[PDB]
Design a binder for this molecule. Structure first.
Ligand SMILES: Nc1nc2c(ncn2[C@@H]2O[C@H](COP(=O)(O)OP(=O)(O)OP(=O)(O)O)[C@@H](O)[C@H]2O)c(=O)[nH]1
Ligand SMILES: Nc1nc2c(ncn2[C@@H]2O[C@H](COP(=O)(O)OP(=O)(O)OP(=O)(O)O)[C@@H](O)[C@H]2O)c(=O)[nH]1
Ligand SMILES: Nc1nc2c(ncn2[C@@H]2O[C@H](COP(=O)(O)OP(=O)(O)O)[C@@H](O)[C@H]2O)c(=O)[nH]1
Ligand SMILES: [Mg+2]
Ligand SMILES: [Mg+2]
Lengths: 103, 430, 430, 430
C-alpha cells in the first residue's frame, strides 16, 4: 500500500537545493579443541555424553515442525488483510457515493 | 527451493555488487552483520544458527577494491575466502586477463562456484556483472562464461554488461576489448542487458535533479532494476514470471539477445507526492525514448518483444487498459510478424527505499525489458571506432605480446558484421 | 454415486480450483477444518460426489494438484480452505517449463507424469461408480497446456467410456501477458479436440468486460474472475448433487448438446449478475433471468453470438419455480430470434430445473450454448500463429527439445480444417 | 468529466495568468499551497491525496517572470516542470520567436501538452493568452497554434489576445508583429477576443475612480471576464452554455471570429450599495459604447450576434423584459439577415471578490461577448501604421536576418485587405 502524508509534512521541496547542498556537505595449534562459543561446532563438555540420536531427533523434529505451523498461520493472515481491505473499499465506495449524493 | 548465484568481476562489477547487496540486505531485513534482529533463500543460505551468507563471489586481480570491501561495515557478511583477489592488474589489456594472469586465478573461482552450487537444490541460473571496457573485467568474464558453458551446459546465465557511451569515454583503448568481449559473449550468454553510463547520467540530471552525480547514484538505480527483475522469485504475486521463462518470450532467434531496459517512476521526495503516480502515467513514462537506460533511440527501429514488470498495488485491468493505449499510438510500431509482443508480470511487494539515497518511497513501479531492432546503432558506432585505429594497427603490440594471435581481431570484426546483417535481415517485413 | 474427481494443472488452474473448492465447501457448509456445520439435511445426502470420508469424521476433496514448479501450491496451501487438500496429492517438479510447450510435454512433463498418474489411478479405481473427470487449465502457459493435454490423452486411453470435461482459458489478443501464447495455444488445440468429450472456453477479456459493465465495480482483480468462473463451474453439476424436477447429469448434456463428435467447444454464462447499488431495484423473475441469460455481453467469451447461429442451447435453472413459465419463455426466446437459430434442427434448447438455489440467491441460471460464432477465436489465434511462424520466430526454443516444424504444420492444418468444418454447418440449409 | 487547458506565453500572458489563477483558487476554496483546509475538476486535477494541480502551462524565453513566479507564495501550487523557461529573449522580434529560438523550445511544450491531455477524459478545448505586440508572445503563440491545429484537429481553441491601443503604444515596432500574428491566427484560431489596454484604462478611470492604475488592475478585470465566461461549466444554472456552443451562435462565417467584450457592473464598495443594481440597468450599462473592453465604437457598425452571460439571482423573465428594451432603442441596430441575435445564459453563482482588490461584492453581474461589424477600424488603423514604415522598408533588416523571407510581409498585408473587404461585403443589406 504505497502512501504519503500531507504537503506540510514533507516541507523540504519549494525550490530546494538542500539536496545539492547535501552533496556539497559530503565533500600444537589447539583450535581443534577450542572452537569459538559462537560457532555451531561447540558442544558443551557437560552435554558431551548424551548418546542418543533417537530421542534428540524426535525432539528436534517436533520443534522443526512447529515453526512451520506458526508461520503458516501468520502468512495467511497477511493474505486475508489485503483482501479484507479490498472488500471494505468496494463497500466504502458504495457508502461514499451515497454520502456525496446525500450531501 | 529456488536459488540464483551472482558473479561480480572487475572494479565496476564489484562496485555495482556492493550497491545491490545493500539493497537486498535492507529488503530482507538482514542487518549488515548478517544477523536478523522464507523468502531469503533465493539469494542467501542459512548457516544453522544465526547469520546468513550471500550466494555471491567477488573477483578482481587488483586488490584495492576487495581490501576496501573487507574493511567496511560489511566485513562480517561475506565468507572470507570467496573474495578472490589477485596481485597484478591486467591494466585495461584484454589479452592479459584472458591468456596471462586470468588463467591462474580462474581455477579457484571455478572451485568456489562448484562449492556454492552443490549447496543449492533448485538452481535457477547465474547472474554476472562486468564493465566491458576494462582488461580484467572483460577477459575474466569471457573466460568464466566459456568455462561455465561447458561445465554446466543448459543452465541460464544473465549478463548485465556496461558498454561505453557513444562519445563519453574514460579510456582510449576500450573499443578493442569491448569488441573482443562482445565476440566472446555473443555465443556464450543467454541474455545481455545494455547499461551505458551516459543515458543514466541524463536520467539522473533530468529526473533526480542531481547536477553532480557519482558512480554510487548510477549503481543504486542498477540495483533497483535488478531487484525489480528478481522480485517475482521471492514474493507472492498475481502473475509470476521465472528466469527460465525468458528465452521463450524475448529471444526470437538464438543470435539476438541484446536488449535495453528502462525504469519508472524516478522521482525525488520533494515533488513526488504532489502527483498521483497512476499506472497509466508510469507506463507511459517507461516507454519514453528519453528514459531508456541505454543511450539508443527506439524511434529508429521496430520492437520485437516487450517484457515489463510491475510491483505494488497494481490491478491487471488497469495494466490492460494501458497496453491498449500504447498499441494505439502511432509513434511506436512493432514488427510485422509479432501481433502481440507484451509479457506482463504483477507483484505485490512495493519497491524498498535505501536511507540516504535518491529515490523516494512509492506504491507503484514498472520495469521494462524490451528487445528492439534499433540496438544495431551502438554496434555500428563501436565498429566505426574500432576500424579507425585498426587501419593503422595502433595499440596492437600491447596485445600481440601477451600471447594473442594477429588474426584474432579480424574474426571479431566479421562476427559483428554478421550480427549487423542479421539485425537488418530480421527487421524487414514479409 | 456417479461422482467425479478433480484434476488441475498450472498456476491458472490452481488459482481457479482454489476458489472452486471454497465455493463448493461454502455451499455444503464445510468449515475450513473439514468439519460439517450445515443447516439442511440435503447438504449431506450427496456429499460423496466431490468429498471423501476419513476417520475422525472430517471430509477431504478428491482433488489432484500438479505443476512443474512448487511455488503456486506452496502458496495455495496458506490460503483459506487450503488445509482441506490432502498433502499426498501434491506432485511437483524442481525445474519448471518457462512457458515452453515442448519442455512441458516432451522432456520434463513426460518423466514426472508417472507419479501423478499413479495417484489419479488410485483415486479412480476406488470410487463407487465413476461419472468422469473435470479438468481446469490454461492454454496460455507452457507447463499447463502441455502436461494437462498429455494427461488428457493418457486418461482417455485408459477410460474410453467415461466422460471428460475441460475448462480451458485461451489467450485473447487484447490482454496479452506472454509473447509465445499463439504457439502453445495452437499446439494445444490440436490435441484437445481429439480427446476431450467437452470443452468450455473462458477468456480474461470477457471477464474484465463483464466486471466493468454489469457489476460496475471499480477495481477488478483475479479473485472476482475466479469467483465468476467458480460459480459457473458449480452451476453445471448442481442438479447432480440436489433433487429437482428434471435431473440431468453431465452425460445427458453431452448427448443433447453435441451433434457431431468434433463439435464440442461451448461458451457459457451465468445469471443473474447485478451491481451492489442496484441489487435492491431488481426483482428476480424468470423473464428477467432469461433476458440476461441470452444477452451477448453476458457470455464468458469475447465471441459475439449474434455473428452466428446457435446449433443448440442449454439452461440449468436453480430454485423453486413453475415449469410452464420456463417452457413458454424458452419458446418465446426461440420464436423472436429465429434468424439466429439453425433451421434444420427444430426445438434446439434444453432446459432443466433444480429446486436448491445457490446460498444467498433465490434463482440462478447457468447457460451452455453450442454456437457457430466460436470460429472467430480460432481465426485470430491462427492468424497470429501464421504471422509469427512465417519468420520462424522463437522456433529454436521448441526445436531444441526434439520437436520439429512438421508438427507445427500438421497442427495448423488440423486447426484450419476444424475452423472450416465448424462453419460448414452454418451455411447448411434444409 | 469536463476539462479545459489554458496556455500562457509571454510576459503579458504570464502576468494575466497569475491574475486568473488567484481568482480560480479563491473561488474554489483552494489555499495558495494547493490544499483544501466536485466543481474543481474543470480547471484542476486530483493527485489522490491532498493537493490540486492546475491544468495550466507557463511559457517564456526570458526567465525573470518565471523566476518571480517560482519564488512567490504560489511556488508550491504549480508542477515544477511545467513552467518552461528559455535563456535568450526574442526581444520584440517576431522572426526570432518563430524561426530561431522558439523551435527548440516548442517540442517540450508540446510534450507537456500531451502529458496534460492524456489525463483529461472530456476535454472541452484550449485557452491561450498572449500579448500580441511582442516577439516571443506572438511568435510562440503562432507556432503553438499551428502545431496544435494539426496534432489535435477539431478541438476548439480560444485566444484572448491584447492588441495595441490606437495611439498609446509601448514599443515602436509592434505593428509589424501584430500584423504577422493576426495573419497566423486568422486561419488557426476559432475565437479571438479584443483586449487593448486603453479602453480598460478608461473603464478604470471612469468607474473604479483610480487615477493611477497598474497592470494588476487590468489583469483582475480580465480574470473576472474569464471566470464569468467559464462559470457555466462548473456551477449549476437554469440556462447553461458550453464552449462548443459558440461557433454555432456567434460565428456567421469561418473567417469572421473577432469580437469585442464588455462587463457590468464595475463599481467600488464606497458607492455600490447606494443603488439597487437591477438587471435592467446593468444590461443597459453593458451595451454602453464607453464600456466596451476594446477601444472601438459600436455605433459605427452593425451587430451580428450577441452572446451575453448573467450570474447571480437573475430571473429569465427580467432578462427578456430587458432584451426587448434594447431591441426597442434606435441607436442600436442589427444586421438585416439576423432577426434574433441574442444568446442568453443564466447562472446562479454570484461573482467572487478578491481581497484587497478593486471590485466590490454584488449579487448580479452581466458579461457580454458581441460580434459586430465595427471591428474593421482597428484593422484599418493598424494597416495604415504598417504601411507608413513598410514603404521605406524600415526595421526590415532585423527580420530578414533572422531567417524570414522578404515576401512574407506582403501576404499578411493581402490577407488583411481580404479581411477588410469581407467585413464590408457582409455588412451590406440584401
Ligand atoms: N556504471 C559504472 N561503470 C563503471 C564504474 N566503474 C568503472 N566503470 C566503467 O568501467 C570501464 C573500465 O573498466 P573498469 O571496471 O573501471 O576496470 P576493470 O573492469 O576492473 O578492468 P581493469 O582496468 O583491468 O582493472 C570504464 O570505462 C567505466 O565506464 C562504476 O562504478 N559504475
Ligand atoms: N494588458 C496587459 N498588457 C501587457 C502587460 N504586459 C505587457 N503588455 C503588453 O505587451 C506588449 C509587449 O509584449 P510583452 O508581453 O510585454 O512582451 P513579450 O510578449 O513577452 O515579448 P518579448 O518582448 O519578446 O519578451 C506591450 O505593448 C504591452 O501593451 C500586462 O501586464 N497587461
Ligand atoms: N482467472 C485467472 N487467470 C489467471 C490467474 N493467474 C494467471 N492467469 C492467466 O494465466 C495466464 C498465464 O498462465 P501461466 O501462469 O503461465 O500458466 P502456467 O504456465 O501453467 O503456469 C495469463 O494470461 C493470465 O491471464 C488468476 O489468478 N486467475
Ligand atoms: Mg581495475
Ligand atoms: Mg518579455
Amino acid at each position: 500500500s504505497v502512501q504519503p502524508r500531507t504537503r506540510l509534512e514533507r516541507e523540504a521541496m519549494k525550490d530546494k537545493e538542500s539536496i545539492e547542498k547535501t552533496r556539497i556537505n559530503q565533500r600444537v595449534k589447539q583450535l581443534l579443541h577450542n572452537p569459538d562459543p559462537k560457532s555451531t561446532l561447540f558442544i558443551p563438555e557437560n552435554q558431551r555424553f548424551d548418546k542418543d540420536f533417537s530421542v534428540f531427533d524426535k525432539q528436534q523434529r517436533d520443534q522443526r515442525f512447529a515453526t512451520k505451523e506458526v508461520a503458516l498461520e501468520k502468512h495467511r493472515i497477511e493474505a486475508l488483510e489485503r483482501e479484507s481491505k479490498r472488500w471494505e473499499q468496494m463497500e466504502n465506495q458504495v457508502n461514499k457515493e451515497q454520502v456525496k449524493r446525500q450531501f | 527451493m529456488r536459488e540464483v548465484i551472482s558473479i561480480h568481476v572487475g572494479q565496476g562489477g564489484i562496485q555495482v555488487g556492493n550497491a545491490c547487496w545493500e539493497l537486498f540486505c535492507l529488503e530482507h531485513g538482514i542487518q549488515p552483520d548478517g544477523q536478523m534482529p522464507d523468502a531469503f533463500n533465493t539469494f542467501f543460505s542459512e548457516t544453522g544458527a544465526g547469520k546468513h551468507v550471500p550466494r555471491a563471489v567477488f573477483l578482481d586481480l587488483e586488490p584495492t577494491v576487495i581490501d576496501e570491501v573487507r574493511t567496511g561495515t560489511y566485513r562480517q557478511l561475506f565468507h572470507p575466502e570467496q573474495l578472490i583477489s589477485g596481485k597484478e592488474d591486467a591494466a585495461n589489456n584484454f589479452a592479459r586477463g584472458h591468456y596471462t594472469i586470468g588463467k591462474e586465478i580462474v581455477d579457484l573461482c571455478l572451485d568456489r562456484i562448484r562449492k556454492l552450487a552443490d549447496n543449492c537444490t533448485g538452481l535457477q541460473g547465474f547472474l554476472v556483472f562486468n564493465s566491458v571496457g576494462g582488461g580484467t573485467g572483460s577477459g575474466l568474464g569471457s573466460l568464466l562464461l566459456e568455462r561455465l558453458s561447458v561445465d554446466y551446459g543448459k543452465k541460464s546465465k544473465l549478463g548485465f554488461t556496461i558498454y561505453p557511451s557513444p562519445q563519453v569515454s574514460t579510456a582510449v583503448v576500450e573499443p578493442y576489448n569491448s569488441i573482443l568481449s562482445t565476440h566472446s559473449l555473443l555465443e556464450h550468454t543467454d541474455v545481455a542487458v545494455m547499461l551505458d553510463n551516459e543515458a543514466i547520467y541524463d536520467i539522473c540530471r533530468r529526473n533526480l535533479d542531481i547536477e553532480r552525480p557519482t558512480y554510487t547514484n548510477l549503481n543504486r538505480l542498477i540495483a533497483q532494476v535488478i531487484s525489480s527483475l528478481t522480485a517475482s522469485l521471492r514474493f507472492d504475486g498475481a502473475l509470476n514470471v521465472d528466469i527460465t521463462e525468458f528465452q521463450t518470450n524475448l529471444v526470437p532467434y538464438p543470435r539476438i539477445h541484446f536488449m535495453l531496459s528502462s525504469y519508472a517512476p524516478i522521482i525525488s521526495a520533494e515533488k513526488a507526492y504532489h502527483e498521483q503516480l497512476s499506472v497509466a502515467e508510469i507506463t507511459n513514462s517507461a516507454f519514453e525514448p528519453a528514459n531508456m537506460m541505454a543511450k539508443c533511440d527506439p524511434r529508429h527501429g521496430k520492437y520485437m518483444a516487450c517484457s515489463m514488470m510491475y510491483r505494488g498495488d497494481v490491478v491487471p485491468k488497469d495494466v490492460n487498459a494501458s497496453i491498449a493505449t500504447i498499441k494505439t499510438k502511432r509513434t511506436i510500431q512493432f514488427v510485422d510478424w509479432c501481433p502481440t509482443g507484451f509479457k506482463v508480470g504483477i507483484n505485490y511487494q512495493p519497491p524498498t527505499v535505501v536511507p540516504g539515497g535518491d529515490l523516494a518511497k512509492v506504491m507503484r513501479a514498472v520495469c521494462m525489458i524490451s528487445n528492439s531492432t534499433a540496438i544495431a546503432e551502438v554496434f555500428s558506432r563501436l565498429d566505426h571506432k574500432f576500424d579507425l585505429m585498426y587501419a593503422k594497427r595502433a595499440f596492437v603490440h600491447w596485445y600481440v605480446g601477451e600471447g594473442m594471435e594477429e588474426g584474432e581481431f579480424s574474426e571479431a570484426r566479421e562476427d559483428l558484421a554478421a550480427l549487423e546483417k542479421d539485425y537488418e535481415e530480421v527487421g524487414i517485413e514479409t | 454415486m456417479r461422482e467425479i474427481v478433480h484434476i488441475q494443472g498450472g498456476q491458472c488452474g490452481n488459482q481457479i480450483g482454489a476458489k472452486f473448492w471454497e465455493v463448493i465447501s461454502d455451499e455444503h457448509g464445510i468449515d475450513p477444518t473439514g468439519t460439517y456445520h450445515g443447516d439442511s439435511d440435503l447438504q449431506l445426502e450427496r456429499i460423496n460426489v466431490y468429498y471423501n470420508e476419513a476417520t475422525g469424521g472430517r471430509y477431504v476433496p478428491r482433488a489432484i494438484l500438479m505443476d512443474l514448479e512448487p511455488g503456486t501450491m506452496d502458496s495455495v496451501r496458506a490460503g483459506p480452505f487450503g488445509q482441506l487438500f490432502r498433502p499426498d496429492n501434491f506432485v511437483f517438479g524442481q525445474t519448471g517449463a518457462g512457458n515452453n510447450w515442448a519442455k512441458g510435454h516432451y522432456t520434463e512433463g513426460a518423466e514426472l507424469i508417472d507419479s501423478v498418474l499413479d495417484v489419479v489411478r488410485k483415486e479412480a479405481e476406488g470410487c463407487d461408480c465413476l461419472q468422469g473427470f473435470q479438468i481446469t487449465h490454461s492454454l496460455g502457459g507452457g507447463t499447463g497446456s502441455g502436461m494437462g493435454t498429455l494427461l488428457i490423452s493418457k486418461v482417455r486411453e485408459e477410460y474410453p467410456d467415461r466422460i471428460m470435461e475441460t475448462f480451458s482459458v485461451v489467450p485473447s489478443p487484447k490482454v496479452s501477458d506472454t509473447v509465445v501464447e499463439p504457439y502453445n495455444a495452437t499446439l494445444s488445440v490440436h490435441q484437445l479436440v481429439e480427446n476431450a468429450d467437452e470443452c468450455m472456453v473462458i477468456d480474461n477479456e470477457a471477464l474484465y468486460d463483464i466486471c466493468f459493465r454489469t457489476l460496475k465495480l471499480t477495481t477488478p482483480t483475479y479473485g472476482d474472475l475466479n469467483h465468476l468462473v467458480s460459480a459457473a463451474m458449480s452451476g453445471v453439476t448442481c442438479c447432480l448433487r440436489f433433487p429437482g424436477q428434471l435431473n440431468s447429469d453431465l452425460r445427458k448434456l453431452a448427448v443433447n448438446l453435441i451433434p457431431f463428435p468434433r463439435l464440442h467447444f461451448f461458451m457459457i454464462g451465468f445469471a443473474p449478475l447485478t451491481s451492489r447499488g442496484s441489487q435492491q431495484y431488481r426483482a428476480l423473475t424468470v423473464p428477467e433471468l432469461t433476458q440476461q441469460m441470452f444477452d451477448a455481453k453476458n457470455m464468458m467469451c469475447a465471441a459475439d453470438p449474434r455473428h452466428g447461429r446457435y446449433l443448440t442451447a442449454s439452461a440449468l435453472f436453480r430454485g423453486r419455480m413453475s415449469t410452464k413459465e420456463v417452457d413458454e419463455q424458452m419458446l418465446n426466446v426461440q420464436n423472436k430470434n429465429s434468424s439466429y437459430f439453425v433451421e434444420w434442427i427444430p426445438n434446439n434448447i434444453k432446459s432443466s430445473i433444480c429446486d436448491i438455489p445457490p446460498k444467498g440467491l433465490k434463482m440462478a441460471v447457468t447457460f451452455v450454448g453450442n454456437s457457430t460464432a466460436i470460429q472467430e477465436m480460432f481465426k485470430r489465434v491462427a492468424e497470429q500463429f501464421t504471422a509469427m511462424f512465417r519468420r520462424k520466430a522463437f522456433l529454436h526454443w521448441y526445436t531444441g527439445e526434439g520437436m520439429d516444424e512438421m508438427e507445427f504444420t500438421e497442427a495448423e492444418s488440423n486447426m484450419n480444417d476444424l475452423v472450416s468444418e465448424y462453419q460448414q454447418y452454418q451455411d447448411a440449409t434444409a
